[PDB]
C-alpha cells in the first residue's frame, strides 16, 4: 500500500525499497528503527552508502547518486531513501 | 535559542551551522527550502557533499564522515545536517 | 586525524610519512599531485625508490622492502606509500 | 572493454595485461583480491617484481622500470600495473 511520490531508481529497485519498507514497518514501530532497518538492508543488497528518513513532518534537501533515490508514502509514514557517499 | 542534541563536528563549525540555520529560518517558510539553504551554503563554505533534514516529526538513520555531523533544535524544528560523499 | 591501518615502518618514518602527507594535503588537490609530492619527498630523504597511491576506493597487492611500508588514512582519503628496491 | 589511459610497454605486454585482468574479474569481486590474482601471474609471465592497483577512484605517482608501465580502465575499474 505504497504511493511513489518521486523516484530516480530502477523499477525493480523501487519495489525492493517498498518491499523492504513493508517489512521494516512490520518489525519496528519507531521511525528511527524503521530507517535503520532500511538503510542496513540496502547497504547489503546494494553497495554503501545509503540514508533513510522516516517521518510524517519534515523537509529535506539531499544530494544523491543518479538512479539511487526514492521518496514514497507507506502506511502513515513518508520514507526517503537515497544513496550518496 | 538553539539546543544541540548530538554533534561530531568542531565548535566553530557547530556555531556556523546554527547561525546558517537561523538565517534560513528568517528567509524561508517551507522546511524543504530551509534545508536547501543550509545544504547549499555548507557545500560552498565547506566541501561537498552535505545533506539537511528540517522538520518536527521524522526519524533518520544516516552515515556521515567523521567530524561532520550535527543534530540540533532551532525554534520549533529539528535540524539534521551532515556530510556524506 | 590520522589513523594508521597497516604499517611496517619506523615510528619516526611513520611520523614523517603523516607529516609529509598533511603538507601535501595543504597544497594540492588532485590525488596524482598529492602522490607525486609524497613520492618525491620520500625519494630524497630516504633512498629511492618509493611509490605512492592516493585515493578513497582502491585495492592493492604490492611487494615492498621491509620497514618501508605504510597504509593510513588522513581524513577520508587513504594513502599507500612503500619502497620496492 | 579496455581503454588504456597511458602506457610505456610493448604491444604484447599491452595486450597481456588485459587478458589476465579481464579473467581475474570473472573470478574475484574484491579489489585487493583482483590485484593479488593479476600481480602474481605477472611475476610469472615476466619475472618479478610487479605491483598492481585495482580501484575506481585513486591517484598514483610511481616510479617504474622503463618500458614497464601501464594504467588502464576496464569497465568501471582502473588497473595500474608496473614492474619495480
Amino acid at each position: 500500500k505504497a504511493v511513489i511520490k518521486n523516484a530516480d531508481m530502477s523499477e525493480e529497485m523501487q519495489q525492493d525499497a517498498v518491499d523492504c519498507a513493508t517489512q521494516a514497518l512490520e518489525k519496528y514501530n519507531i521511525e528511527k528503527d524503521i530507517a535503520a532497518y532500511i538503510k542496513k538492508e540496502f547497504d547489503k543488497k546494494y553497495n554503501p552508502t545509503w540514508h533513510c528518513i522516516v517521518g510524517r513532518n519534515f523537509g529535506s534537501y539531499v544530494t544523491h547518486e543518479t538512479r539511487h533515490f526514492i521518496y514514497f508514502y507507506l502506511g502513515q509514514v513518508a520514507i526517503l531513501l537515497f544513496k550518496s557517499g | 535559542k538553539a539546543v544541540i542534541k548530538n554533534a561530531d563536528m568542531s565548535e566553530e563549525m557547530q556555531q556556523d551551522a546554527v547561525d546558517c540555520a537561523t538565517q534560513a529560518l528568517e528567509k524561508y517558510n517551507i522546511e524543504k527550502d530551509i534545508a536547501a539553504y543550509i545544504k547549499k551554503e555548507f557545500d560552498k563554505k565547506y566541501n561537498p557533499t552535505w545533506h539537511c533534514i528540517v522538520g518536527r516529526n521524522f526519524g533518520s538513520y544516516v552515515t556521515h564522515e567523521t567530524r561532520h555531523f550535527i543534530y540540533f533544535y532551532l525554534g520549533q524544528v529539528a535540524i539534521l545536517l551532515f556530510k556524506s560523499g | 586525524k590520522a589513523v594508521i591501518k597497516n604499517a611496517d615502518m619506523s615510528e619516526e618514518m611513520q611520523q614523517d610519512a603523516v607529516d609529509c602527507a598533511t603538507q601535501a594535503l595543504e597544497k594540492y588537490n588532485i590525488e596524482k599531485d598529492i602522490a607525486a609530492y609524497i613520492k618525491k619527498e620520500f625519494d630524497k630523504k630516504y633512498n629511492p625508490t618509493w611509490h605512492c597511491i592516493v585515493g578513497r576506493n582502491f585495492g592493492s597487492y604490492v611487494t615492498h622492502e621491509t620497514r618501508h611500508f605504510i597504509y593510513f588514512y588522513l581524513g577520508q582519503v587513504a594513502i599507500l606509500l612503500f619502497k620496492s628496491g | 572493454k579496455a581503454v588504456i589511459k597511458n602506457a610505456d610497454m610493448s604491444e604484447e605486454m599491452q595486450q597481456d595485461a588485459v587478458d589476465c585482468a579481464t579473467q581475474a574479474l570473472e573470478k574475484y569481486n574484491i579489489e585487493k583480491d583482483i590485484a593479488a590474482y593479476i600481480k602474481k601471474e605477472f611475476d610469472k609471465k615476466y619475472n618479478p617484481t610487479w605491483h598492481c592497483i585495482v580501484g575506481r577512484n585513486f591517484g598514483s605517482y610511481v616510479t617504474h622500470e622503463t618500458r614497464h608501465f601501464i594504467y588502464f580502465y576496464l569497465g568501471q575499474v582502473a588497473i595500474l600495473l608496473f614492474k619495480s
Binding site: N6, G59, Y61 | - | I30, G55 | T63
Partner: peptide, 25 residues
C-alpha cells in the same frame, strides 16, 4: 633505467540534488 608515472581516475558518478516536503501533520 627508471621512469616516473602519474595516474588519475576519470570515473564520474552522476549527481543530483533533490528536495522533498512532507506535511502529514
Amino acid at each position: 633505467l627508471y621512469k616516473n608515472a602519474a595516474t588519475q581516475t576519470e570515473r564520474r558518478t552522476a549527481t543530483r540534488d533533490a528536495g522533498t516536503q512532507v506535511r502529514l501533520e
